């Protein structure tokens, strides 16, 4: 049986993603800044060849808006598809391919604490 998603999913959700994009390290450092948006196609034609399927927090953000996701597990594999794009096209080492293992634990704490699932 197909249904919508409950409105306690929803706020799940976005609570989530909420605490993910808000995080900021030891420094004050917000880590989800450069992830919010996906770099131009004008600008950066190479992260469109390399990443199969680019995303970005603004496109997930409007995945939940759209009950694009039907579960956390279906939120959850957006959020490390992200992480795992921005360690597919950038460095090991580099800034960026390190926040983006700091931002997979912050999501995993998240999901632990805003749903309680155990
Ligand atoms: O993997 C990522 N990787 C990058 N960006 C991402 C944005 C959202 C999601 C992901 Cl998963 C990534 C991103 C965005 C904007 C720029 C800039 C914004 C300022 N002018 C030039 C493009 C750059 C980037 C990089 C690629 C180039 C090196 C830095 C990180
Ligand atoms: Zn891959």
Redesign the pocket.
Same mark, same amino acid.
């Given at each position: 049986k197909l249904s919508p998603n409950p409105p306690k999913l929803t706020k799940q959700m976005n609570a989530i993603i909420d605490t993910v994009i808000n995080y900021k390290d030891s420094s004050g450092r917000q880590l989800s800044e /450069? #992830? %919010?948006? &996906?770099?131009?196609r004008k600008? &950066?034609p190479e992260?469109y060849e390399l %990443?199969r399927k680019? /995303?970005? #927090?603004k496109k997930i953000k409007e995945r939940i808006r759209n009950h694009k996701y039907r579960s956390l597990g279906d939120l959850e594999k957006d959020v490390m598809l &992200?992480?795992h794009?921005?360690q597919? #096209?950038?460095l090991e080492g +580099?800034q %960026?391919y390190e926040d +983006?293992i700091v931002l997979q634990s912050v999501f995993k704490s998240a999901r632990q604490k805003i749903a309680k699932e155990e």
């Open positions: /450069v #992830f %919010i948006q &996906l770099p131009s600008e &950066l992260y %990443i680019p /995303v970005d #927090f &992200l992480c794009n921005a597919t #096209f950038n +580099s %960026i +983006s």
